[PDB]
């Protein structure tokens, strides 16, 4: 067939995943879910939460070490050490986002508990439905965290999230509240697909590299070699912008907008679609440039030209030292320009088709870029596990 069974882990984490999430959402005490962008997002502060605080401290966590290690490199002992420093740094990451998830807990619990639709939230205040929520929030963070790790043992620490996207992106296409305007013009589904193709493009970035080999262990002992091969294979290293691009930048723009909707006595003025193009280009400079800069770790030539390396790409490479980062710097910001063209064209995709008939139901762009994101990454799970044994298969 096409499935070609063998994957002794596949259906495993898959089914296990569905289990943990069912109890997880219908959880007692919170389970919140069982100016237009604000009332459509949902929350007390600014976090879409299918559950109290689990996927939130998740994005939160990733964010914690994100910007922290970002603008502030090494301030307290840990950077990168392959194993030792990586764990010391990881542990700090743990406790870090943990207490952070706590802050958001007390807050979201407050506002929510006293002002949302379809309440059915009693008022028998004894332990504060805030300390009670803090419970299902901190403890809730755990069940999802604990689950994540295990999920990261057969699937991915984001496999839990794709389960959420899978669910969300499956609730709207089964006609849950999408048939009041439009309908029977489902070109919008196929067009979204075109966006999918775009996404795939991002991945292969400018992936290219140099030469030489070496390995040093123990104390004062190592080696070296000559030349005389006869094989295929070559050197690969350049790249392009990682994950969660447009999403991180877009959310930012939604911030000055929300506050601009409810400042003093609601200073209602325009800032929805009009200023779009301007805020959209912001997604460009912001995401692409900033990340891709740190991202393609300014120090690459240091390690490369250190272990003795003179690149070979887009033509027979040469000059070593930082001069290499120069040539690469060019390809860097250039491929980044192109990258912007595509990702930015995603948010712009609905904007380029919604010029004749506009739909005030954009639900599908960001969430999709996420769901597909994890899809692609899981494809990496298969990319490796694939290819059983090519030896003797059709030979000795």
């Amino acid at each position: 067939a096409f499935k070609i069974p063998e994957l002794r882990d596949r259906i495993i984490f898959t089914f296990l995943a569905l289990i943990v999430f069912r109890m997880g959402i219908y959880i007692p005490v919170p389970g919140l879910n069982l100016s237009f962008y604000d009332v459509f997002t949902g929350g007390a502060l600014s976090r879409f939460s299918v559950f109290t605080m689990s996927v939130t401290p998740y994005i939160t966590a990733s964010i914690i070490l994100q910007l922290l290690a970002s603008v502030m490199p090494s301030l307290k002992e840990m950077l990168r050490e392959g194993e030792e420093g990586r764990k010391k740094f990881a542990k700090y990451t743990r406790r870090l986002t943990l207490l952070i998830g706590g802050f958001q807990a007390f807050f979201v619990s407050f506002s929510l508990a006293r002002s949302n639709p379809d309440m059915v939230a009693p008022g028998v205040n004894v332990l504060q439905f805030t300390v009670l929520s803090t419970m299902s929030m901190l403890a809730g963070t755990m069940f999802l965290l604990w689950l994540g790790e295990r999920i990261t043992e057969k699937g991915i620490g984001n496999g839990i999230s794709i389960l959420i996207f899978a669910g969300i992106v499956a609730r709207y296409p089964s006609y849950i509240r999408q048939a009041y305007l439009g309908g029977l013009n489902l070109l919008e589904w196929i067009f979204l697909i075109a966006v999918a193709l775009i996404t795939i493009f991002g991945i292969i970035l400018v992936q290219q590299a140099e030469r030489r080999i070496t390995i040093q262990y123990a104390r004062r002992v190592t080696g070296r070699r000559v030349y005389g091969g006869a094989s295929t294979y070559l050197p690969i290293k350049v790249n392009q912008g990682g994950v969660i691009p447009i999403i991180f930048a877009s959310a930012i723009v939604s911030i000055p907008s929300a506050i601009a909707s409810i400042t003093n006595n609601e200073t209602l003025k325009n800032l929805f679609r009009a200023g779009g193009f301007l805020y959209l280009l912001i997604y460009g400079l912001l995401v692409f440039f900033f990340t891709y800069f740190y991202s393609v770790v300014i120090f690459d030539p240091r390690e490369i030209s250190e272990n003795i390396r003179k690149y070979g790409g887009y033509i027979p490479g040469l000059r070593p030292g930082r001069s290499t980062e120069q040539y690469l710097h060019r390809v860097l910001n250039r491929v980044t320009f192109i990258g912007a063209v595509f990702l930015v064209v995603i948010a712009l995709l609905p904007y380029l088709v919604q010029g004749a008939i506009k739909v005030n139901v954009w639900i599908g762009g960001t969430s999709a870029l996420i769901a597909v994101g994890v899809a692609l990454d899981i494809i990496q799970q298969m990319e490796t596990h694939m290819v059983m044994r090519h030896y003797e298969g059709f030979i000795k």
Partner: protein, 816 residues
């Protein structure tokens, strides 16, 4: 279920197994002589298989301990008793002094061996292989077995000499004057009527690889054991009992069993086609870098290149070509070579034995390793730096000393250790645990801090006077230095100040012998390299310990916490006191390049102006963190090849497991041809349609042989795979047996062919496997980072590899 909840739960577990077994030894002191012999026969047939005969371990171990008591004392402590216990389980009892690692080991070694399979007993070095080999040899002839130790190039293992000796203890077995005056672990010195007869059991005769392994116990060094395992490759004859199955093993000083990160590769046949070139060439080479100054940046790893003066020099000599890279790096290679040679490795660490003129490498925690090199460029580089230049540069095979080896089959139980450093390790790969046990009188020895001193090894000078003050007080001292150079100067120091002493720093092997007992004989002064200061049944003569007991001066702190402690621990056996002290210089080495950037500000800003003795503000504190830190790097690199080689364990497997089946079997005829064709025929129908010029052309390159078979014969459309297959198949099979006309001897032809050809191809493509290691040096950026690209390329090369074989191996079975 993980805490002391586990360590302690282990306590009672054994405190129980011990109580019972303890009663066993109690009612057996009935001078069981000939009856004990019968017990050697009893247990002999009581197992005969790894059915894990538990109960036996109880009465057997009992016999073990007592067996020793009769042959030679040393057997009343428990971390050895309980040792063998947990040992048979697969973890690590011990921690040194008294304990019994020598005897202990013997205990489980006995039960397991009984299987008749042969058990492994890893030990760091030759000198030690011989150590345990004889230190417990007695009980073996007592329990009628055959010891078996292997070393560098020769191997031996046995008991007493010829016939008289046997006819000496044979009756003294029935006699065995000893069982009396017992009841006390106070094994004094007496019963000479027993020693003078039995204690002379220590003797050894020459044998070979075969009988060695298949014998009973196999005493050896991982270096060797590994090489033996691999020796099992270009074995045209399987009759070669080169190692009889690999599986169980107990590690003597396993705190090292792990640190053997660098893989185990047997390299040898180097057909240099450019030997004469290298000669003259490399001469010029070496001199080239000589031409350039210091600036060339050489640190933190043995990889180097130079900036300005570098590019300058490159052009400054044989090569007005600025842009050197253009597939012209072969020459630059020459520069980097010498470059690294003359510097990365002091020729004084790759010494030249007394006018042997042979540039040997005694590096890597060893102690003199004859003719060999860790690479295909260094040996000839330094050779060009000294005098007599060789002409070798070969590879052949490699393997991870542990997981790839030990985990290839069965278990392990190490000896000594304790730190958390090893548990995570004994998990991620080996799959063992820890059983920390303090024998009678725990850590009875004294220690002193890491007394530091600044600016240069001038502290080593201050340590000199130290050795002195000790000498005067009549204290037997010893120092554990880092390398051969510093070791020498050390002696010279004592001489410049007039101080008797002996130096066992890989000078001569015989030295290691004399010094064995001649190291620490009241006031005696001995200096040696860590390579001789790591685990040893050292002792001491007369009053000796009168004051302090023993003294140990460390020249610095190694690349590892344990090792540091080890060099120290060499002062305390049987359960006696001692003294240790470390002298460190903020300009030593450990931190001269590692953590220097830290120690820098933390010092020059904290304080600079002072005397010599200091360690009040973060000194020993900081350096500590650096130590573990360094070990961390090793841990890291440990990963790279560990993980990779794991995927290699698979590939390699199919490799000579296939070379095995071909060595065994006979007429693979129909198979080789068939697969050769189906492979070469699909080739004629994979990237070239079976049309006309399309195939005739591309297939031509696919069929480039001096032979003649329908080569220029076109005009054919009857190619339904069946037709084409039979056409070439008969040219083969027919001309095969038709060529079989040579003689029955033709059988061993595919032998030479298959193996050599296969062996050849593989090892060759292994060279390429090293280049692929570079591709995994690429994964770092872009795609993931879990050995991805490597695994996908490891098989790509694996499939390419095989198909290649069938082609060459084929045409080779003809031209003759």
């Amino acid at each position: 279920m993980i805490l002391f909840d586990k360590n302690k739960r282990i306590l009672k577990k054994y405190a129980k197994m011990v109580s019972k077994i303890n009663q066993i030894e109690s009612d057996l002191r009935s001078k069981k002589n000939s009856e004990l012999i019968r017990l050697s026969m009893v247990l002999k047939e009581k197992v005969n298989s790894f059915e894990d005969a538990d109960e036996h371990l109880f009465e057997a171990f009992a016999l073990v301990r007592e067996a020793a008591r009769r042959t030679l004392g040393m057997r009343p402590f428990d971390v050895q008793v309980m040792g063998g216990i947990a040992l048979h389980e697969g973890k690590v009892a011990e921690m040194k002094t008294g304990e019994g690692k020598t005897l202990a080991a013997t205990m489980p070694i006995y039960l397991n061996a009984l299987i008749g399979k042969g058990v492994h007993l890893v030990t760091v070095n030759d000198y030690l292989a011989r150590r345990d080999a004889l230190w417990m040899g007695p009980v073996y002839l007592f329990l009628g077995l055959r010891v078996g130790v292997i070393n560098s190039l020769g191997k031996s293992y046995e008991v007493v000499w010829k016939n008289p000796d046997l006819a000496r203890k044979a009756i003294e077995e029935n006699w065995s004057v000893w069982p009396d005056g017992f009841n006390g672990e106070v094994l004094k010195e007496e019963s000479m009527n027993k020693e003078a007869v039995e204690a002379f059991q220590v003797e050894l005769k020459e044998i070979t690889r075969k009988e060695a392994y298949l014998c009973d116990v196999t005493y050896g060094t991982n270096n060797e054991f590994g090489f033996d395992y691999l020796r099992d490759n270009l074995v045209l004859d399987y009759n070669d009992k080169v190692q009889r199955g690999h599986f169980y093993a107990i590690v003597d000083e396993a705190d090292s069993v792990l640190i053997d990160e660098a893989r185990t590769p047997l390299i040898i046949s180097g057909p240099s086609k450019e030997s004469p070139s290298v000669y003259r060439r490399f001469a010029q080479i070496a001199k080239k870098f000589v031409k350039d100054k210091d600036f060339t940046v050489d640190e933190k790893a043995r990889t180097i290149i130079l900036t300005e003066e570098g590019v300058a020099k490159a052009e400054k000599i044989i090569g007005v070509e600025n842009l050197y890279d253009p597939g012209n790096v072969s020459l630059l290679y020459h520069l980097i070579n010498a470059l690294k040679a003359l510097h990365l490795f002091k020729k004084d660490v790759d010494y030249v034995v007394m006018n042997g003129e042979v540039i040997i490498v005694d590096e890597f925690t060893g102690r003199l390793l004859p003719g060999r090199r860790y690479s295909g460029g260094l040996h000839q580089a330094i050779e060009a730096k000294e005098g007599v230049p060789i002409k070798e540069e070969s590879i052949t095979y490699a393997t991870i000393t542990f997981q790839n080896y030990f985990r290839m089959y069965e278990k392990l139980a190490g000896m000594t250790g304790t730190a958390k450093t090893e548990e995570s390790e004994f998990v991620q790969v080996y799959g063992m645990e820890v059983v920390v046990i303090p024998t009678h009188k725990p850590m009875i020895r004294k220690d002193h801090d890491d007394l530091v001193f600044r600016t240069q090894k001038e502290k080593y000078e201050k340590i000199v006077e130290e050795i002195e003050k000790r000498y005067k007080k009549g204290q037997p001292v010893l120092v554990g230095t880092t390398s051969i150079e510093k070791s020498e100067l050390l002696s010279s120091m004592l001489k410049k100040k007039g101080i008797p002493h002996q130096v066992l720093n890989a000078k001569y092997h015989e030295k290691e012998a004399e010094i064995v007992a001649k190291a620490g004989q009241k006031g005696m002064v001995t200096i040696a390299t860590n390579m001789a200061g790591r685990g040893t049944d050292i002792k001491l003569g007369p009053g000796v310990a009168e004051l302090g007991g023993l003294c140990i001066i460390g020249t610095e702190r190694h690349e590892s916490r344990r090792i540091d402690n080890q060099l120290r621990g060499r002062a305390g056996r049987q359960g006696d006191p001692g003294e240790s002290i470390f002298f460190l210089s903020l300009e030593d080495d450990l931190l001269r390049i590692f953590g220097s950037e830290q120690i820098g500000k933390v010092m020059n800003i904290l304080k600079i102006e002072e005397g010599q003795p200091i360690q009040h503000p973060m000194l020993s504190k900081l350096i500590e963190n650096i130590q573990k830190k360094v070990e961390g790097i090793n841990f890291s690199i440990r990963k790279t090849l560990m993980e990779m080689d794991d995927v290699l364990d698979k590939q390699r497997r199919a490799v000579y497991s296939l070379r095995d089946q071909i060595l065994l079997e006979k007429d693979y005829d129909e198979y080789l041809k068939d697969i050769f064709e189906d492979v070469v025929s699909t080739r004629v129908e994979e990237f070239c349609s079976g049309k006309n010029w399309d195939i005739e052309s591309l297939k031509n390159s696919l069929s480039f042989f001096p032979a003649g078979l329908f080569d220029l014969d076109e005009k054919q459309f009857s190619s339904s795979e069946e037709l084409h297959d039979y056409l070439f198949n008969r040219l083969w099979e027919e001309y095969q047996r038709k060529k079989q006309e040579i003689g029955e001897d033709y059988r061993k032809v595919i032998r030479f062919l298959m193996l050599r050809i296969i062996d050849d191809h593989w090892r060759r493509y292994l060279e390429e496997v090293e280049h692929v290691k570079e591709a995994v040096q690429l994964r770092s950026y872009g795609q993931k980072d879990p050995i991805v690209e490597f695994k996908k390329e490891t098989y790509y090369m694996f499939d390419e590899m095989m198909r290649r074989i069938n082609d060459t191996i084929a045409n080779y079975v003809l031209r003759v």
